[PDB]
Design an enzyme around this catalytic site. Sequence first.
Site, PDB file in Angstrom:
ATOM      1  N   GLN A 174       0.810  -1.213   0.000  1.00 41.73           N
ATOM      2  CA  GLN A 174       0.000   0.000   0.000  1.00 41.73           C
ATOM      3  C   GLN A 174       0.846   1.268   0.000  1.00 41.73           C
ATOM      4  O   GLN A 174       0.320   2.343  -0.292  1.00 41.73           O
ATOM      5  CB  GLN A 174      -0.939   0.015   1.215  1.00 41.73           C
ATOM      6  CG  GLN A 174      -0.206   0.117   2.552  1.00 41.73           C
ATOM      7  CD  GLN A 174      -1.157   0.043   3.730  1.00 41.73           C
ATOM      8  OE1 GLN A 174      -1.560  -1.041   4.148  1.00 41.73           O
ATOM      9  NE2 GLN A 174      -1.525   1.201   4.273  1.00 41.73           N
TER      10      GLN A 174
ATOM     11  N   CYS B   7      -5.023   0.836   3.951  1.00 41.29           N
ATOM     12  CA  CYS B   7      -5.134  -0.569   4.352  1.00 41.29           C
ATOM     13  C   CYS B   7      -6.570  -1.075   4.282  1.00 41.29           C
ATOM     14  O   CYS B   7      -6.813  -2.224   3.893  1.00 41.29           O
ATOM     15  CB  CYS B   7      -4.570  -0.765   5.759  1.00 41.29           C
ATOM     16  SG  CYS B   7      -5.300   0.345   6.985  1.00 41.29           S
TER      17      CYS B   7
ATOM     18  N   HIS C   4      -5.030  -0.965  11.966  1.00 42.84           N
ATOM     19  CA  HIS C   4      -4.563  -1.462  10.678  1.00 42.84           C
ATOM     20  C   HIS C   4      -5.492  -2.583  10.239  1.00 42.84           C
ATOM     21  O   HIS C   4      -5.742  -3.518  11.003  1.00 42.84           O
ATOM     22  CB  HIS C   4      -3.120  -1.950  10.815  1.00 42.84           C
ATOM     23  CG  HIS C   4      -2.465  -2.341   9.519  1.00 42.84           C
ATOM     24  ND1 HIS C   4      -2.338  -1.483   8.449  1.00 42.84           N
ATOM     25  CD2 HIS C   4      -1.858  -3.493   9.151  1.00 42.84           C
ATOM     26  CE1 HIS C   4      -1.720  -2.104   7.459  1.00 42.84           C
ATOM     27  NE2 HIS C   4      -1.412  -3.326   7.860  1.00 42.84           N
TER      28      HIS C   4
ATOM     29  N   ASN D 217      -0.947  -9.350   4.744  1.00 37.60           N
ATOM     30  CA  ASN D 217      -0.728  -7.926   4.971  1.00 37.60           C
ATOM     31  C   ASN D 217      -0.513  -7.253   3.615  1.00 37.60           C
ATOM     32  O   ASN D 217      -0.366  -7.917   2.589  1.00 37.60           O
ATOM     33  CB  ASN D 217       0.478  -7.724   5.916  1.00 37.60           C
ATOM     34  CG  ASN D 217       0.495  -6.363   6.615  1.00 37.60           C
ATOM     35  OD1 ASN D 217      -0.397  -5.544   6.443  1.00 37.60           O
ATOM     36  ND2 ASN D 217       1.517  -6.134   7.420  1.00 37.60           N
TER      37      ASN D 217
END
EC number: 3.4.22.2
Length: 212
Positions: free
Chosen positions: A19, A25, A159, A175
């Site tokens: 990202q 996120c 997050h 992630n």
Amino acid sequence: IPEYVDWRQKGAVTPVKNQGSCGSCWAFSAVVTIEGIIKIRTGNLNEYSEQELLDCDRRSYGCNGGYPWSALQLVAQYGIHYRNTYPYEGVQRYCRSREKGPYAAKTDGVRQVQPYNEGALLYSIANQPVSVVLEAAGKDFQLYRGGIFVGPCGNKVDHAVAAVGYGPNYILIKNSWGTGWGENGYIRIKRGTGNSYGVCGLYTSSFYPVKN
């Protein structure tokens, strides 16, 4: 539900993304779940547009943060384009959905997992990838290289990521920090600690798309 789930092995997870500095996120997390449910329902694995959600989710705040549930609501209400049609730029720009032709995929709704309930999250993961949140601010999470992660970490979630599997002692997380972080971009977070927040607050807020 079984002892191990790994949606990568079913061909329902696209490559790991980065990202960048943008606080997008929430859009990456939502896209992982869309990519998964479309593969599960239709048999085809496609990449969908984080940038579209960044630009077009009026309830979120672009690179200043946002909400996976509103991003997923946007995809059920309108649709989403392919990533190739609407590639990631790392900055919020004008919503360009209408200029980019028909949507590529559409979902039918959004559901929330019952919060603070490990079994409920595992049940949903056995069915599809799920959008989850965690506390990433701590250096231990920032520097994570591998293994089953136990912290240290608090529960001040900040997050959004995606749960794409689990095993006896962990939940498997995709992630959005690139392939050089963690286990080729993944983290295995310890489960079964009896703390209702989840390790790093993992059970705080989890959503998934519904597709008939």
